[PDB]
């Protein structure tokens, strides 16, 4: 089924967020969200996202991943939101048939991991996730446990948590 998004009260914001220290390449090493996830799936492959901070304090955000036979890219702009560490998708008013998103950096140490919360609407359909980012692809058990704990705190069952499989194609 479809779990409702937690209130923002339950989503910490990283105190004193430093946009220029969050810049750079991250691997998506965990994700928990309210979308379905069935068991005869192909495993979800790890991909990377590069946050490039601009002068104007927006990020150019580029993701790269591996499909079945080719590398894929996705590029978009995140602009600052209401508090440091919060961003929204895109520079101008929601283009005719568009997506909108809120992004909140919950925690990060900049040089190892980050947990970032996303609420997305697309074609009037709502979803949310928490993404666990790493500077490297290796995810150790204590951090997996902390992410499972955090995801439960937002109302997500274990079966809505995935740790993407590390791969070498495209993302290095």
């Amino acid at each position: 089924d479809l779990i409702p998004a937690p209130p923002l009260s339950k989503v910490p914001l990283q105190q004193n967020f430093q946009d220029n220290q969050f810049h750079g390449k991250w691997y998506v090493v965990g994700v928990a969200g309210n979308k379905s996830l069935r068991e005869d799936k192909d495993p979800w492959k790890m991909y990377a996202t590069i946050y490039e901070l601009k002068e104007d304090k927006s990020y150019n955000v580029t993701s790269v991943g591996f499909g079945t036979k080719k590398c894929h890219y996705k590029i978009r702009t995140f602009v600052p939101g209401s508090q440091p560490g919060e961003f929204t998708l895109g520079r101008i008013k929601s283009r005719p048939g568009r997506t909108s998103a809120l992004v909140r950096v919950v925690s990060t140490n900049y040089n190892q991991h980050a947990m970032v919360f996303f609420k997305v609407v697309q074609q009037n359909r709502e979803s949310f996730n928490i993404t666990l980012y790493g500077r490297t692809k290796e995810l150790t058990s204590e951090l997996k446990e902390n992410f499972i704990r955090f995801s439960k705190s937002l109302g997500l069952p274990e079966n809505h948590i995935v740790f993407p499989v590390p791969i070498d194609q495209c993302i290095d």
Binding site: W44, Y47, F66, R76, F118, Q122
Partner: peptide, 13 residues
């Protein structure tokens, strides 16, 4: 389905 399955999901499609 999606290669880009976390973050601003679907924003490319």
């Amino acid at each position: 389905k999606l290669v880009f399955f976390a973050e601003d999901v679907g924003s490319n499609k």
